[PDB]
Amino acid sequence: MRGSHHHHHHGSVSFGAPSPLSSESEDEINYMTPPEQEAQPGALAALHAEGPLAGLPVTRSDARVLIFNEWEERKKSEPWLRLDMSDKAIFRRYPHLR
C-alpha cells in the first residue's frame, strides 16, 4: 500500500527600527591633559663609602637622584642654576657608570 501528500507555508516579517547613538565624544570624561612634570615622585640614592668615588652614586637611578637633589638645593639658594640628565652627563660626571 502507498500514497500520501502534505505541504504548507505562510507569512513574512521585518523590524526597520535600530537605536544608534553618537552624542558623546569624551565631553564629560575629563582628565585628558592634567598638569604634571614628574612620573616617579619620592626617591633615594645609594653611595660609595671609600676611594675616589666616596660620596658618589652606585646606579643610574642614584646618579639621576643626586643630579636632581643637588641642583634642587643649590638652585633653591642659586635660582640661575642649569639642569641636564642625558646619558653623556652621567658618563662624564660618573665614569664608573658608563
Residue with cell string 616617579: 40
Phi, psi of 60, deg, nearest 5 = -65, -35
How far is C-alpha 65 from the geometric centre of its chain's CA atoms? Answer: 19
What technique determined this structure? NMR
* Calpha distance 79→12 (Å, rounded): 82
Neighbouring C-beta atoms of residue 22, cutoff 10 Å: 5
Cell numbers found for residue 71 = 641642583
Q: Please enumerate, as own/partner, the contacts of 45-49 that have beta carbons within 8 Å and a separation of 24 or more.
A: 45/69
* Calpha distance 69→90 (Å, rounded): 15
Put residue 30 in one of left, alpha, beta given phi > 0 → left and psi -120 to 50 → alpha: left
